[PDB]
């Protein structure tokens, strides 16, 4: 169905421990496909999915140069940020950027993204219009003024409507065996008595891709959202993900509870129960 491509930058200063580190990772949906780390050998953009290995030397040279240039640019940006927030050169700080595009089933742009953070807080964001900016504070407003003056939004829009979607479409075709395959969750409910009076029912979802999933417990048909323990969806290490949802239920009432599972790989939402 719908797909995304996102690049994620992390630039981290470390006073007394050399120049700021710059890392880029690229994803299509929940699949890492390229990485760059300025602390490497030998820093280069490196493939992390088989389908990107098809790209020729020109691709890799260009992608590496972009990242090597960015390493320098973001060191400058970290120095500028100190000035914008009246901070000393003694402390460690982080700039992050995430940008990319979503496409629909027909491959057309659904929306574009470009957003930055400083020390884990929103800094500046390209608006959905791909023409204006939202600055989080008076520091980011200085950057906004610079970017408005240079018509940066217009350049980004050109990329997001063009190369972003064009390359993503190519990746989806080259990786169609995996990127265009949903793996539904394998599901089961486990039973763990806490006491004579109460038991834990845990609804498991394993081996699914992509990561998006909904697990919900109902008691007599009513969602138990406030009373459910939901763990963060977690990577298995084989591309797939795992998740569980747990409720504490009175002993002898287990059959009043039903777990409901929604995932792209399922033809319809699934309902399951404790099966002793």
């Amino acid at each position: 169905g719908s797909h995304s491509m996102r690049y994620f930058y992390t630039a981290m200063s470390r006073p007394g421990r050399g120049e700021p580190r710059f890392i880029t990772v690229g994803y299509v949906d929940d699949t890492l496909f390229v990485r760059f780390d300025s602390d490497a050998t030998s820093p280069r953009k490196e493939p992390r999915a088989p389908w990107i290995e098809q790209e020729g030397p020109e691709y890799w040279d260009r992608e590496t140069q972009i990242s090597k240039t960015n390493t320098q640019t973001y060191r400058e940006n970290l120095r500028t940020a100190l000035r914008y927030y009246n901070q000393s050169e003694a402390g460690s700080h982080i700039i992050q950027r995430m940008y990319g595009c979503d496409v629909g089933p027909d491959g057309r742009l659904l929306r574009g993204y470009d957003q930055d953070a400083y020390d884990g807080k929103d800094y500046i964001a390209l608006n959905e219009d791909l023409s204006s900016w939202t600055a989080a504070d008076t520091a980011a407003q200085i950057t906004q003024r610079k970017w408005e003056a240079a018509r940066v939004a217009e350049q980004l829009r050109a990329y997001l409507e063009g190369l972003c979607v064009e390359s993503l479409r190519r990746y989806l075709e080259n990786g169609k065996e995996t990127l265009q395959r949903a793996d539904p969750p394998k599901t089961h409910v486990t039973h763990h008595p806490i006491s004579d009076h109460e038991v834990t029912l845990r609804c498991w979802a394993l081996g699914f891709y992509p990561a998006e999933i909904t697990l919900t417990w109902q008691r007599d048909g009513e969602d138990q959202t406030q009373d459910t323990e939901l763990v963060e969806t977690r990577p298995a290490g084989d591309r797939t993900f795992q998740k569980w949802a747990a409720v504490v239920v009175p002993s002898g009432e287990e059959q009043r509870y039903t777990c409901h599972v929604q995932h792209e790989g399922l033809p319809k939402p699934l309902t399951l129960r404790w099966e002793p």
């Binding site: 981290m12 020390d119 884990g120 963060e232 290490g237």
Partner: protein, 99 residues
């Protein structure tokens, strides 16, 4: 800055004693990015543990997967030890095969 890590310790596949598997420690939701993670077998650090490339979520918090091949048993205890600027001392989380 600053957000303490969430920690989950778990296996790639359901644990069966004597069957080879992968032990995972997923650390997430943290900021800043520097973090120390060891996998422990009976209290001792497992050597040559690998990890994923630094990534982050929509809320800017970082996540990493640390992992190593292992063959679980009834006797052997596994854990993940994590240190971060937000933690006074390293936090140890024991592997529970039901979690």
């Amino acid at each position: 800055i600053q957000r303490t890590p969430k920690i989950q310790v778990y296996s790639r596949h359901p644990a069966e004693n004597g069957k080879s598997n992968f032990l995972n420690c997923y650390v997430s939701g943290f900021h800043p990015s520097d973090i120390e993670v060891d996998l422990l077998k009976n209290g001792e650090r497992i050597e040559k543990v690998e990890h994923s490339d630094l990534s982050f979520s929509k809320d800017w918090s970082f996540y990493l997967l640390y992992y190593t091949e292992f063959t679980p048993t009834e006797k052997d205890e596994y854990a993940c030890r994590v240190n971060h600027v937000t933690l006074s001392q390293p936090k140890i989380v024991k592997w529970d095969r039901d979690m």
